[PDB]
Structure 1
């Protein structure tokens, strides 16, 4: 039966590495944590190793491992993410921040031995020097959002579309429109997602005992519709 279903049987260790440049501002993120696909649970802590992070943490959330998503039995046949393992998959995205700049990301997610690794490249351009993102106007929070997993037969993978609302201090809201492509790293078999989706629920926090610019992240993700 199933592809790499057995790999996410228990608690998996996660390693995250991001290298990005936004409007010329270089920076690097490293994160360690663990995931429990059984419960769609993820616990991570990210550290900005290049000093102080230039953008807002919240804006990195989506970029910073859907294979940890909990799939209810009746819909396991659409688990594209777990089926690409251990080989992995490449996840690409364009994230447009309404009336602002956008992010371009390239990532590869795969197992390095028993560690699930997310290696990522990020590039930010057209950011208004005095807007929400660059002029840190975003609140340190997150909205339980949904992701519209839509197959893309041709790329042998999938395509996804969704948007994210970021709460602006003023009580308003900054929009982030995601466009994501996903192609399998191996040449192997993968499951093709019927038009489904993911109910997600994040929770960012701080570690008082942490002197470095960082973000604590707790999150549950489940597949529905």
Structure 2
């Protein structure tokens, strides 16, 4: 049968993203709009910095900017925590440690507001170097593919993950961003606690040639894979 959560994602769903950020005291806000199509694990979003110039590189915000849109293969459906929490939603919390630099702490509430899937985020960054790779804008405007290992977090009735993102720098090295993540349901209703599995991500960053505001266009695909060999 199709679950309550699953039924909400059978077609194309509008997405709204709102982020309020503060990195080393530099305040900024971002709004995003687009659509998700979970049947294909597909996200298409455009983000605009509504406060002027973004004080950090756009790529550093990609992981922060709706895992309920992942494609879970039929045989994997029992491991989809994210849709199972809907429509009431879930909270995603992360700490993102940029190696040899500062860290972000994020809290996101992901839930439906009517027919729109909303990702409401607060981000605080501390201990950044004003001339490091982040505040110095030394990251390439691109993005690598990554696999994320999802684990149940029984004590929190949710899931957790840790994974390392590699942001390419033009000197050929990378800026590592070490992510630690915990997700908790917003409702007190039932959720699916998964066995360990992977989410595979591909992300493409682009610009709208007609857009004068500081912005990012993101195309992202997310697909689950299991551990039955």
State the superposition RMSD in angstroms. Answer: 0.7
Whole-Å Cα distance in 2 between the matches of residues 179 and 88 of structure 1?
20
Gaps of 5+ in 2: none
3-state secondary structure, aligned to 1:75? helix
How is 1:62-73 mapped onto 2 (pairs within 5 angstroms)?
A: 62-73=63-74
Whole-Å Cα distance in 2 between the matches of residues 115 and 66 of structure 1?
15
Quick check: 1:19–1:27 contact (8 Å CA) kept in 2? yes
Q: Which residue of 1 aligns with 2:80?
A: 79
Whole-Å Cα distance in 1 between the matches of residues 193 and 162 of structure 2?
16
Whole-Å Cα distance in 2 between the matches of residues 211 and 19 of structure 1?
21
Quick check: 1:84–1:189 contact (8 Å CA) kept in 2? yes
3-state secondary structure, aligned to 1:18? strand
Quick check: 1:3–1:84 contact (8 Å CA) kept in 2? no
Gaps of 5+ in 1: none
Whole-Å Cα distance in 2 between the matches of residues 195 and 50 of structure 1?
40
3-state secondary structure, aligned to 2:4? coil
Superposed displacement of residue 2, structure 1: 2.5
Whole-Å Cα distance in 2 between the matches of residues 44 and 165 of structure 1?
22
Whole-Å Cα distance in 2 between the matches of residues 147 and 12 of structure 1?
24
Quick check: 1:41–1:221 contact (8 Å CA) kept in 2? yes
Q: Runs in 1 of length 4+ with deviation above 3 angstroms?
A: none
Q: Using structure 1 for the length normalisation, give the TM-score.
A: 0.99
Q: Using structure 2 for the length normalisation, give the TM-score.
A: 0.97
3-state secondary structure, aligned to 1:8? coil
Superposed displacement of residue 3, structure 1: 3.5
